[PDB]
Amino acid sequence: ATFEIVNRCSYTVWAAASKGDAALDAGGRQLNSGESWTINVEPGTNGGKIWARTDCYFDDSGSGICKTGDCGGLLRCKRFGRPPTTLAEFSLNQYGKDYIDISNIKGFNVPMDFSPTTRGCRGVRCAADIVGQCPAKLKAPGGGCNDACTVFQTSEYCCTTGKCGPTEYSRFFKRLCPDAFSYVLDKPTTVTCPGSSNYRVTFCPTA
Description:
By secondary structure, the chain is mainly beta. The chain has helices spanning 130-133, 148-152, 155-158, 168-176; strands spanning 2-7, 13-18, 23-31, 36-40, 48-53, 57-58, 64-65, 87-94, 97-103, 112-116, 124-126, 191-194, 199-203.
Protein backbone atom coordinates (compact mmCIF):
# COMPACT_ATOMS: atom_id res chain seq x y z
CA ALA A 1 0.00 0.00 0.00
CA THR A 2 1.19 3.49 -0.86
CA PHE A 3 0.99 6.36 1.60
CA GLU A 4 1.70 9.77 0.09
CA ILE A 5 3.01 11.96 2.84
CA VAL A 6 2.61 15.65 2.08
CA ASN A 7 3.93 18.56 4.10
CA ARG A 8 1.57 21.58 3.67
CA CYS A 9 3.07 23.25 6.80
CA SER A 10 5.03 26.48 6.32
CA TYR A 11 7.94 24.85 8.21
CA THR A 12 10.06 21.78 7.51
CA VAL A 13 9.01 18.50 9.14
CA TRP A 14 10.81 15.18 9.20
CA ALA A 15 8.18 12.52 8.49
CA ALA A 16 8.50 9.21 10.32
CA ALA A 17 6.90 5.83 9.75
CA SER A 18 7.26 2.70 11.97
CA LYS A 19 5.38 -0.27 13.34
CA GLY A 20 7.21 -0.05 16.64
CA ASP A 21 9.78 -2.78 16.11
CA ALA A 22 10.79 -1.84 12.55
CA ALA A 23 10.79 1.01 10.05
CA LEU A 24 8.13 1.13 7.40
CA ASP A 25 9.90 1.86 4.07
CA ALA A 26 12.94 4.03 4.80
CA GLY A 27 11.31 4.98 8.11
CA GLY A 28 11.96 8.71 7.95
CA ARG A 29 12.78 11.63 5.58
CA GLN A 30 12.92 15.42 5.57
CA LEU A 31 9.93 17.15 4.01
CA ASN A 32 10.34 20.86 3.26
CA SER A 33 7.22 23.01 3.01
CA GLY A 34 5.23 21.61 0.11
CA GLU A 35 7.14 18.39 -0.48
CA SER A 36 5.54 14.99 -0.91
CA TRP A 37 7.20 11.67 -0.09
CA THR A 38 5.46 8.41 -1.11
CA ILE A 39 6.17 5.31 0.91
CA ASN A 40 5.29 1.69 0.45
CA VAL A 41 3.93 -0.18 3.44
CA GLU A 42 3.79 -4.00 3.32
CA PRO A 43 0.21 -5.48 3.24
CA GLY A 44 -0.81 -6.92 6.65
CA THR A 45 1.12 -4.22 8.54
CA ASN A 46 -0.44 -4.19 11.99
CA GLY A 47 -0.05 -1.21 14.33
CA GLY A 48 1.68 1.15 11.85
CA LYS A 49 2.14 4.80 12.67
CA ILE A 50 3.17 7.85 10.72
CA TRP A 51 3.98 11.12 12.39
CA ALA A 52 5.78 14.42 11.93
CA ARG A 53 8.88 15.52 13.77
CA THR A 54 9.89 19.17 14.25
CA ASP A 55 13.18 21.10 14.71
CA CYS A 56 15.53 18.23 13.94
CA TYR A 57 19.27 18.24 13.30
CA PHE A 58 20.87 15.23 11.67
CA ASP A 59 24.52 14.70 10.88
CA ASP A 60 25.83 13.02 7.71
CA SER A 61 25.21 9.48 9.09
CA GLY A 62 21.54 10.26 9.95
CA SER A 63 21.99 10.69 13.74
CA GLY A 64 20.76 13.67 15.67
CA ILE A 65 17.77 14.92 17.53
CA CYS A 66 14.23 16.28 17.07
CA LYS A 67 12.30 18.48 19.53
CA THR A 68 9.11 16.47 18.96
CA GLY A 69 8.76 12.90 17.81
CA ASP A 70 12.42 11.92 18.09
CA CYS A 71 12.74 8.17 17.53
CA GLY A 72 16.09 7.45 19.28
CA GLY A 73 17.93 10.21 17.36
CA LEU A 74 17.67 8.52 13.94
CA LEU A 75 16.59 10.18 10.61
CA ARG A 76 15.34 6.81 9.57
CA CYS A 77 12.98 5.76 12.38
CA LYS A 78 12.78 2.11 13.48
CA ARG A 79 10.74 2.77 16.65
CA PHE A 80 7.97 5.11 17.78
CA GLY A 81 8.70 8.76 18.45
CA ARG A 82 9.02 10.76 21.64
CA PRO A 83 5.79 12.58 22.61
CA PRO A 84 4.25 14.92 21.84
CA THR A 85 3.25 13.42 18.46
CA THR A 86 -0.01 13.60 16.57
CA LEU A 87 -0.36 10.03 15.19
CA ALA A 88 -1.75 8.60 11.96
CA GLU A 89 -2.47 4.93 12.93
CA PHE A 90 -3.34 1.99 10.72
CA SER A 91 -3.61 -1.74 10.51
CA LEU A 92 -3.82 -3.09 6.96
CA ASN A 93 -5.49 -6.32 5.66
CA GLN A 94 -6.95 -7.38 8.97
CA TYR A 95 -9.41 -10.05 7.98
CA GLY A 96 -10.12 -8.34 4.69
CA LYS A 97 -10.18 -4.67 5.83
CA ASP A 98 -7.99 -1.68 6.68
CA TYR A 99 -8.37 0.33 9.87
CA ILE A 100 -7.28 3.94 10.20
CA ASP A 101 -7.49 6.65 12.89
CA ILE A 102 -5.68 9.71 14.26
CA SER A 103 -4.73 9.69 17.93
CA ASN A 104 -3.88 12.38 20.45
CA ILE A 105 -3.14 9.81 23.20
CA LYS A 106 0.60 10.59 22.85
CA GLY A 107 -0.09 14.39 22.58
CA PHE A 108 -0.19 16.73 19.60
CA ASN A 109 2.63 18.45 17.69
CA VAL A 110 1.44 19.04 14.10
CA PRO A 111 -2.01 19.17 12.54
CA MET A 112 -2.85 16.23 10.33
CA ASP A 113 -5.29 14.86 7.78
CA PHE A 114 -5.28 11.06 7.19
CA SER A 115 -7.40 10.16 4.08
CA PRO A 116 -7.74 7.26 1.63
CA THR A 117 -6.79 8.05 -1.98
CA THR A 118 -8.92 5.13 -3.15
CA ARG A 119 -12.70 4.47 -2.83
CA GLY A 120 -14.95 3.24 -0.08
CA CYS A 121 -14.41 5.10 3.19
CA ARG A 122 -13.74 8.59 4.50
CA GLY A 123 -10.75 10.31 6.04
CA VAL A 124 -10.13 11.67 9.49
CA ARG A 125 -8.60 14.98 10.55
CA CYS A 126 -7.14 16.73 13.58
CA ALA A 127 -6.29 20.19 12.26
CA ALA A 128 -7.34 22.48 15.14
CA ASP A 129 -4.76 24.71 16.83
CA ILE A 130 -4.11 22.41 19.76
CA VAL A 131 -0.59 23.75 20.42
CA GLY A 132 -1.82 27.39 20.71
CA GLN A 133 -4.78 26.45 22.95
CA CYS A 134 -2.87 23.80 24.96
CA PRO A 135 -3.66 23.87 28.74
CA ALA A 136 -0.72 25.37 30.74
CA LYS A 137 0.31 22.13 32.42
CA LEU A 138 0.38 20.20 29.16
CA LYS A 139 2.55 22.62 27.17
CA ALA A 140 5.82 20.90 26.23
CA PRO A 141 8.73 23.28 26.76
CA GLY A 142 10.37 21.48 23.80
CA GLY A 143 7.36 22.37 21.52
CA GLY A 144 3.82 20.92 21.18
CA CYS A 145 1.10 19.74 23.60
CA ASN A 146 1.69 16.63 25.85
CA ASP A 147 -0.96 14.12 26.74
CA ALA A 148 -1.62 13.83 30.46
CA CYS A 149 -0.14 10.32 30.81
CA THR A 150 3.22 11.68 29.59
CA VAL A 151 3.02 14.57 32.05
CA PHE A 152 1.61 12.94 35.18
CA GLN A 153 2.27 9.21 34.87
CA THR A 154 -0.92 8.10 36.74
CA SER A 155 -3.06 4.93 36.25
CA GLU A 156 -6.03 7.16 35.37
CA TYR A 157 -4.31 9.08 32.53
CA CYS A 158 -2.30 6.09 31.21
CA CYS A 159 -5.22 3.65 31.56
CA THR A 160 -2.84 1.14 33.00
CA THR A 161 -5.48 -1.07 34.72
CA GLY A 162 -7.73 -0.90 31.66
CA LYS A 163 -10.43 0.96 33.58
CA CYS A 164 -9.93 4.74 33.09
CA GLY A 165 -12.51 7.37 32.11
CA PRO A 166 -12.32 10.71 30.37
CA THR A 167 -10.52 13.52 32.17
CA GLU A 168 -10.35 17.31 32.05
CA TYR A 169 -7.18 16.88 29.96
CA SER A 170 -8.56 14.22 27.58
CA ARG A 171 -11.63 16.49 27.18
CA PHE A 172 -9.51 19.31 25.85
CA PHE A 173 -8.10 17.15 23.03
CA LYS A 174 -11.65 15.75 22.26
CA ARG A 175 -13.18 19.27 22.15
CA LEU A 176 -10.46 20.60 19.83
CA CYS A 177 -10.47 17.35 17.73
CA PRO A 178 -13.61 15.23 18.09
CA ASP A 179 -12.42 12.82 15.38
CA ALA A 180 -9.16 11.75 17.06
CA PHE A 181 -8.63 9.49 20.09
CA SER A 182 -8.23 11.63 23.21
CA TYR A 183 -7.54 8.84 25.79
CA VAL A 184 -7.04 5.03 25.67
CA LEU A 185 -10.71 4.14 26.19
CA ASP A 186 -12.23 6.92 24.16
CA LYS A 187 -15.22 5.92 22.06
CA PRO A 188 -13.50 4.74 18.87
CA THR A 189 -13.11 7.04 15.86
CA THR A 190 -11.51 4.30 13.81
CA VAL A 191 -12.57 4.19 10.14
CA THR A 192 -12.99 0.83 8.33
CA CYS A 193 -11.67 0.97 4.74
CA PRO A 194 -11.46 -1.78 2.05
CA GLY A 195 -8.40 -4.06 2.42
CA SER A 196 -5.41 -2.78 0.46
CA SER A 197 -6.58 0.84 0.25
CA ASN A 198 -3.99 3.59 -0.46
CA TYR A 199 -3.64 6.76 1.62
CA ARG A 200 -2.39 10.31 1.95
CA VAL A 201 -1.13 11.85 5.17
CA THR A 202 -1.14 15.62 5.00
CA PHE A 203 0.55 17.76 7.64
CA CYS A 204 -1.15 21.18 8.17
CA PRO A 205 -4.07 20.34 5.77
CA THR A 206 -5.78 23.74 6.39
CA ALA A 207 -4.48 27.40 6.45
